[PDB]
Design a protein around this ligand. Structure first.
Ligand SMILES: [Cu+2]
Ligand SMILES: [Cu+2]
Ligand SMILES: [Cu+2]
Ligand SMILES: [Cu+2]
Ligand SMILES: [Cu+2]
Ligand SMILES: [Cu+2]
Ligand SMILES: [Cu+2]
Ligand SMILES: [Cu+2]
Ligand SMILES: [Cu+2]
Ligand SMILES: [Cu+2]
Ligand SMILES: [Cu+2]
Ligand SMILES: [Cu+2]
Ligand SMILES: [O]
Ligand SMILES: [O]
Ligand SMILES: [O]
Lengths: 270, 272, 272
């Protein structure tokens, strides 16, 4: 509100047929790196496609002009080997001249390829071309740690079945989760031991906020949400599961651990 | 809040095998026409089934008595060539005698057949017997235009894959979308370049509204929601896609264009 | 709150192959029995597994320590014939020392098995090991009756197709529905003639609550919500259907009746 940030991104081929984004060449990951801005910021992303097929960057939520939408149709993708600057903007909330209220960009969002495999990025998303974006409102509560969980088709973060990811915290830590879904299937995200408000920030504003407090939520492709929890609050340390609650999904491997440790670094049991 | 209104409606079979509603014989559409009323209004719909099978009209949201629920079970459907008057009412919100708060009928709702093909209208809905209904609250912000997008099985508005529909606006217009899902599948509605509040009106009341601002929403059969956006607000003119984000669905043709024009009528990339 | 309460619970196998919980050996139901507490109450449940496989109780929403999470991994399940005391707590909302607002446990929750069939309770849930939990906030409005509707795979309350369940009320009654989904499938819960708020309690706090008012809602495995309605308000008596609105699901039997009676005990169309 409002810095003009410059940033580079690269799409790259990875082991085992995966593809991923990174801020630095040679350092792509699945999921892609978190991009975090404040409302009012502008972001110029100089994106380079280092792969042998056309590729792009498409973002949810943020204000971009049509030349930055990442589609073939608007000639907004990038040749093998090529480079292009995308521009994303964000805006603060406020009253319009007509007296109505402009929302503001703040929320939990995401970016992904829109052109690998099909004109809807089906091959790209499947291979790992997705990552999270957070836009903070002035005065939002900031966490001690942020974790990204993406349910992509039947995987978490494109991992093999039953291999996490796992995430560590300590009783009392303010932990932020960004939850994105991609692919063909619906899922239900569930965490043991912890709960959040079903609203923008995942936190209740005060006693007048009527939002449902939940610990389970249905999600479908390209849905994103986020929340903050206090690790172990009222429940203590432990190896706390998170998983998809669709029964065959969890049985086939969509399960991870939210390892909450005591101040001395132990977990009771595990 | 409240006028009594009278309105005629027809169910017709269409030459290609589909079925639609219309306010006039020979002017059936899919989706059926938009009905819009204020909280407190009553609506007497004189409905005529011009088809050779039994048909009905079932509405979500609004106050109807069991005789107007449109089901076979309640003797509420209509024989071939027959006519029946359905009555829908709406109420304003207010404090009840017990001190609790009665909601009010305002919202984005819909009507569809409940009897063609099966006793839950499976055949009717499939063929196109569905349409939108809006109930406004006093002081609601009104749009310039209202458009209806229905995901019905793997189609938008019962159209062939990759054939829209497309909508048009000029940068700055207040556009209202009513979004309905029907059939067997879950979908995920997404618009490029635009976003809305996940609450009743699609708009935030002011800075105290904690509702999520979104551009992508999961929906299932018979879900309806609506919102208003300012076309191109902060993003400018363009051929802005909307589509289902379930990857196979968009690949197989659930895609459309929201064409936002510069005040000179052009769209960046596509000069006429 | 806070009251400390003690409760006994049992898991039994049933002659048809199903499994259920109950407060008394020989009185297992599917859904299992309602447990209702106030925010701040602690609950000690003496759970005895009477089956020949290991079994557990896992709860959503409430505060439990890892030793009561009901999973194999944290050694929290129970051997055939064994007994174990689970402890569930609830807390009231309030300001934390960091000035942020702690939610409170109030809501519509549920409990289920986590170890029968697989280590996610797949077999247990399928067979019927599930039931509702309600946590009330001080000042919450209390209903006349609470009913539990659980869409478990393609069944309501594990029942055979087209066999309800049917609930009964009189025009004017304050009815509470707790709606839970389990299994592999998504559904959309729909009620004729009635509507509620998509928030914590299902009721609007007053005119500043921008929550969508709905009559249809998409749900997936382990989702729970609840609401209150005034039976027949603005619509009168009738055989009001509720069903899953996914067309093949209702056609194959996920249908029930909410029977709202006149003060003389009758339903329009179906007098005895
Ligand atoms: Cu797209
Ligand atoms: Cu899943
Ligand atoms: Cu759980
Ligand atoms: Cu997307
Ligand atoms: Cu209906
Ligand atoms: Cu119905
Ligand atoms: Cu779809
Ligand atoms: Cu997009
Ligand atoms: Cu319906
Ligand atoms: Cu679990
Ligand atoms: Cu269903
Ligand atoms: Cu569960
Ligand atoms: O997208
Ligand atoms: O329906
Ligand atoms: O769970």
């Amino acid at each position: 509100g409002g810095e003009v940030r410059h940033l580079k991104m690269y799409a790259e081929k990875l082991a085992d047929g995966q593809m991923g984004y990174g801020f630095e060449k040679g350092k792509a990951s699945v999921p892609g790196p978190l991009i975090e801005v404040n409302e009012g910021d502008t972001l110029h992303i100089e994106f380079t496609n280092t792969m042998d097929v056309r590729a792009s960057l498409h973002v949810h939520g943020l204000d971009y002009e049509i030349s930055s939408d990442g589609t073939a149709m608007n000639k907004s993708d990038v040749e093998p080997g090529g480079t292009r600057t995308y521009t994303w903007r964000t805006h603060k909330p406020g009253r319009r001249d007509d007296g109505t209220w402009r929302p503001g960009s703040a929320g939990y969002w995401h970016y992904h390829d829109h052109v690998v495999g099909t004109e809807h990025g089906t091959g790209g998303i499947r291979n790992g071309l997705y990552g999270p974006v957070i836009v903070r409102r002035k005065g939002d509560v900031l966490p001690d740690a942020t974790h990204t969980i993406v349910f992509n088709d039947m995987t978490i973060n494109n991992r093999k079945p039953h291999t996490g990811p796992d995430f560590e915290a300590t009783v009392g830590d303010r932990v932020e989760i960004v939850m994105i879904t991609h692919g063909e299937y619906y899922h239900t995200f569930h965490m043991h031991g912890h709960r959040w408000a079903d609203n923008r920030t995942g936190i209740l504003t005060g006693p007048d906020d009527p939002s449902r407090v939940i610990d389970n939520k249905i999600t479908g492709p390209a849905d994103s949400f986020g929340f903050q929890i206090i690790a172990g609050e009222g429940v203590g340390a432990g190896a706390w599961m998170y998983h998809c609650h669709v029964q065959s999904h969890s049985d086939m491997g969509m399960v991870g651990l939210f390892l909450v440790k005591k101040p001395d670094g132990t977990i009771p049991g595990y």
